[PDB]
Structure 1
């Protein structure tokens, strides 16, 4: 079919011969890797998606019987075939045909099952797609942690985030997406919605108590400067502590959809931040406190503070047990989890004080002790 390919290869549209010149030159030179790179250059170009139906099947067959280049390019070009044709009936036979075609040389089954589950994540089936997604994350936990395949796994966790069933997993994988970003090469115009549903998804995430992990990384605060600061302000208020209710009220009523039912749970979540901040603010000097600061900061009555501290102990972030008779608030171990600069400087102060006190006791006891005992 090599002599028979010159006819349909030479004849093309107006601008296609620009890439068909080097495409037929690399085709006659039989350089499979340069031909593959030229195929990726043709697919990467925004073609009209009208006359490429022939080269998709031609380069599909060539990629099938070439058995030389990494078939991941065939996976991408066949994702463009199913993306251009939108025929899920033949997608199972095509991807299964690639599974039967790819021999046991490289562990490409993670991207094969990733493409299969990704295409199956439509309205047709959800449960079996989640199960084969768990299989995808379960198969290869070995040293090749390129995380690119796991970034496509994050895309599958986004199509799984389309379901309102589980918001927590999208945040746990969204931390991996927060840590796997390399550079800003990908369109920022998409990063607007990425940080938008990433901030809203982080807010609606009920499997975490602190938000300082999201705001702590500089890539998000640096990629949100272009966007409006209506969300950065409420994320800094939700991170550094909500001492007022007017801003969190206006942003609690700013997002209309899906925030009405979750608003009460978000209040039950932010009612603990004032607790951890009020117990980590004063490290010493009469740690013991009273319910007046809790009820004053949370504008709640005295009858609900027992359920408030009961929920605080029910979450498990604090172990505080108060042996009081008259109403008092004694706290215990707690984790800031975001940042504290005054506790870094105070950490240097109390740390240097402890060090010079241990040194003072060592020189004091050892001074005469070494001279009298040795």
Structure 2
């Protein structure tokens, strides 16, 4: 039976030098070397004819020798893509001989990652909804491993492809930013992930940050490889607002998914120009005109009342507009940084105010010099 494994899996020379180590290693009865070297045997990217032929034999020994369960089996079920190439029998195999089989802190949730991720090409967000939700129902405070957050980000993104809540792409991008442990993010492989990044957090409208994620560089490292004028109008998805070439060109290029966003991305920059003008413009002008609204907002003179009353109903600003002369009135707002690392506003207002109330507090002391007596 070890002679059977030797005659079966050793399909080439030089390879069996460690398979003889395996057929002595079972007599040594030490299986953390299993957990390392046979995991490396699982790891091997090739055509891999031996591993799928021998996974049934390794299950025949996995019935007895209490294996380290999730690691090799889950990394090998996608090495089965030479042997079986069918999830509709692999789901049977999987759910029948693996739901009782785990060795981790929480590995029933990686079992649910397997279920949800193998019900992509056979299922469409109907029965995977409950169980993929049940994954983070069971996460909540647990991931002291967080290597399962790799497959949790996989269910996250590959299930977010199944439409529903575009505002969870800033959060799913936080998951991409907070999934991998070491630095290894590919460039020419994650430029396709830049193509889903930019053109799946851009078109949809649950997002409203408009340059906040553009601060983070792991996306622009993947976007400089993509076509620059799409990335130029991505750079115009910042405080440059009218720019009748830029968003026009991304309405030239990006062909699908420009039907529900028809004028609603214009509505997003139409509500966003108000916060960009009450924060960008160097205030003490808060009750103001309307032509800069009808110029930067790419709206007309007439349609600013819909603009201001809908933008008040949204909830990013709460000032009741002086409507008789189309005069703006504003409140609390959300910032997008000041002078390039906040030099000027910080200095000339914050420290100016510091020495203002500090030195006039010294003046309070100066006239209140001996009123303490």
TM-score by length of 1: 0.88
Distance 2:323 2:297 in 1: 21
Which is further off, 47-56 or 244-253?
47-56
Which is further off, 110-119 or 266-275?
266-275
Task: Decide whether the 8 Å contact of 2:319 with 2:330 is kept in 1.
Answer: yes
Distance 2:120 2:57 in 1: 28
Task: Decide whether the 8 Å contact of 2:210 with 2:237 is kept in 1.
Answer: yes
Distance 2:99 2:245 in 1: 61
What is the Cα deviation at residue 191 of structure 1?
A: 0.7
**Closer, same or farther: CA 103–254 of 1 in aligned 2, 3 Å:** closer
Q: What secondary structure sits across from 1:190 in the alignment?
A: coil
Match of 1:255 in 2: 254
Task: Decide whether the 8 Å contact of 2:2 with 2:23 is kept in 1.
Answer: no
Distance 1:51 1:6 in 2: 10
Task: Decide whether the 8 Å contact of 1:211 with 1:239 is kept in 2.
Answer: yes
What is the Cα deviation at residue 61 of structure 1?
A: 2.7
What is the Cα deviation at residue 278 of structure 1?
A: 0.8
**Closer, same or farther: CA 298–100 of 1 in aligned 2, 3 Å:** closer
Task: Decide whether the 8 Å contact of 2:275 with 2:334 is kept in 1.
Answer: yes
> Residue by residue, what CA displacement relative to the aligned partner does 1:71-112 show, whole Å, maximum 9, x if unpaired?
332232234337741333333332223445436873211101
Distance 2:338 2:54 in 1: 55
What is the Cα deviation at residue 340 of structure 1?
A: 5.0
Which is further off, 182-191 or 314-323?
182-191
Q: What secondary structure sits across from 1:341 in the alignment?
A: helix
Ranges in structure 1 where 5+ consecutive residues have no aligned partner: none
Distance 1:286 1:47 in 2: 67
**Closer, same or farther: CA 295–142 of 1 in aligned 2, 3 Å:** same
> Residue by residue, what CA displacement relative to the aligned partner does 1:218-256 show, whole Å, maximum 9, x if unpaired?
222234333332233222210233232112111222111
Q: What secondary structure sits across from 2:188 in the alignment?
A: helix
Task: Decide whether the 8 Å contact of 2:289 with 2:326 is kept in 1.
Answer: yes
**Closer, same or farther: CA 11–288 of 1 in aligned 2, 3 Å:** closer
**Closer, same or farther: CA 196–22 of 1 in aligned 2, 3 Å:** farther
> Residue by residue, what CA displacement relative to the aligned partner does 1:303-333 show, whole Å, maximum 9, x if unpaired?
2111111221222111121234322122221
Ranges in structure 2 where 5+ consecutive residues have no aligned partner: none
The answer to whether 1:31 aligns with 2:27 is no
Task: Decide whether the 8 Å contact of 1:114 with 1:153 is kept in 2.
Answer: yes
RMSD: 2.7
Distance 2:240 2:117 in 1: 39
Output aligned runs, 1:39-58, within 5 Å: 39-58=38-57
Distance 1:214 1:13 in 2: 50
Task: Decide whether the 8 Å contact of 1:210 with 1:337 is kept in 2.
Answer: no
Distance 1:5 1:29 in 2: 19
What is the Cα deviation at residue 42 of structure 1?
A: 2.1
**Closer, same or farther: CA 26–211 of 1 in aligned 2, 3 Å:** farther
> Residue by residue, what CA displacement relative to the aligned partner does 1:18-44 show, whole Å, maximum 9, x if unpaired?
654554454554331212322222232
Match of 2:291 in 1: 292
Q: Which has the higher helix share?
A: 1
**Closer, same or farther: CA 340–70 of 1 in aligned 2, 3 Å:** farther
Between the two proteins, the alignment pairs up a number of residues equal to: 373
> Residue by residue, what CA displacement relative to the aligned partner does 1:47-84 show, whole Å, maximum 9, x if unpaired?
32334332111223333422142433223223433774
